């Protein structure tokens, strides 16, 4: 479950939803599962998720969780 994911698990989840291109930068920023729901648009841009569609897919995958 989400709250228990390590930074590496977050990276694997990103890959599972076809956003693996962002895992290295999420890993470098030590993003863990518990952090995901609170990340803002600005945090995502800082993590390099600059495409609106990617951010929308991240949110959609979080809701589906």
Curated annotation (Swiss-Prot):
Tissue expression: Widely expressed in brain (at protein level).
Domain SAM: 5-65
Subcellular location: Cytoplasm; Postsynaptic density; Cell projection, Dendritic spine
Entry remark concerning the domains of this protein: In isoform 1, the N-terminal region preceding the ANK repeats interacts with the 6 ANK repeats in an intramolecular manner, thereby restricting access to ligands, such as SHARPIN and SPTAN1.
Family membership noted in the UniProt record: Belongs to the SHANK family.
Function (record text): Major scaffold postsynaptic density protein which interacts with multiple proteins and complexes to orchestrate the dendritic spine and synapse formation, maturation and maintenance. Interconnects receptors of the postsynaptic membrane including NMDA-type and metabotropic glutamate receptors via complexes with GKAP/PSD-95 and HOMER, respectively, and the actin-based cytoskeleton. Plays a role in the structural and functional organization of the dendritic spine and synaptic junction through the interaction with Arp2/3 and WAVE1 complex as well as the promotion of the F-actin clusters.
Subunit-level organization: May homomultimerize via its SAM domain. Interacts with BAIAP2, DBNL and SLC17A7/VGLUT1. Interacts with DLGAP1/GKAP, GRM1/MGLUR1, GRM5/MGLUR5 and LZTS3 C-termini via its PDZ domain. Interacts with ABI1, HOMER1, HOMER2, HOMER3 and CTTN/cortactin SH3 domain. Is part of a complex with DLG4/PSD-95 and DLGAP1/GKAP. Interacts (via PDZ domain) with the GRIA1 subunit of the AMPA receptor (via PDZ-binding motif). Interacts with WASF1 and CYFIP2; the interactions mediate the association of SHANK3 with the WAVE1 complex.
Protein name as catalogued: SH3 and multiple ankyrin repeat domains protein 3
Protein's gene: Shank3
Shown segment, full-protein numbering: 1674 to 1737 of 1740
